[PDB]
């Protein structure tokens, strides 16, 4: 349907705008790019599914998100990976964990404020029809 394609275009516009807000926030700079495997060689041994905001943007543009919940699962993963990899008492680890939690809380708060519930339901019903 043209109506269905329009819906997913509106979704991608919305997700890009949310992700941009997160990516320009100074607190979340550490989450904007993939962890560099030459810099942190053990990261991909600990973290099975890396995720970062540049990868999220690429997924939006490659039509990988058909619902808001699918997007939020990747926000969850950015947060959970950070908590898993940086668990220690050290202030540097505590700072990363605080920022990871703030990233997730901020994303959910933006979506709660701005997402029309019938729009997400429509995205879900289209997704479930294909």
Domains of the chain: 1-130 (1.20.920.10)
The alpha helices in 36-116, defined as continuous H runs, are 43-46, 53-61, 68-85, 91-114
Q: Which of 18, 16, 28 has its CA nearest to residue 110?
A: 18
Q: Which of 86, 69, 52, 50 has its CA nearest to residue 11?
A: 69
- Count of Cβ atoms closer than 10 Å to residue 125 Cβ: 12
CA distances 31 to 54, 79, 101, 118, 121, Å, are 8, 9, 12, 30, 29
Q: What is d(CA 37, CA 11) in angstroms, rounded to the nearest whole number?
A: 32
Q: What is d(CA 113, CA 91) in angstroms, rounded to the nearest whole number?
A: 32
- Cβ-proximal residues to 59 (8 Å cutoff; 6+ apart), any chain: 65, 74
Q: Which of 92, 87, 86, 72 has its CA nearest to residue 22?
A: 72
Instruction: Identify how the structure was determined.
Output: X-ray
Q: What is d(CA 108, CA 3) in angstroms, rounded to the nearest whole number?
A: 27
Chain centroid to CA 10: how far? 17
Resolution (A): 1.4
Are 12 and 60 in contact by the 8 Å Cβ rule? The answer is yes
């Amino acid at each position: 349907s043209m109506q269905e394609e329009d819906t997913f275009r509106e979704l991608r516009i919305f997700l890009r705008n949310v992700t941009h807000r997160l990516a320009i926030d100074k607190r979340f700079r550490v989450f904007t790019k993939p962890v560099d495997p030459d810099e942190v060689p053990d990261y991909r041994t600990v973290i099975k599914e890396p995720m970062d905001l540049s990868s999220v943007i690429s997924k939006i543009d490659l039509h990988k998100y058909l619902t808001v919940k699918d997007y939020l699962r990747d926000i969850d993963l950015i947060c959970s990976n950070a908590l898993e990899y940086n668990p220690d008492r050290d202030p540097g680890d505590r700072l990363i964990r605080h920022r990871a939690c703030a990233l997730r809380d901020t994303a959910y708060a933006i979506i709660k404020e701005e997402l029309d519930e019938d729009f997400e339901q429509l995205c879900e019903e289209i997704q479930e029809s294909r």
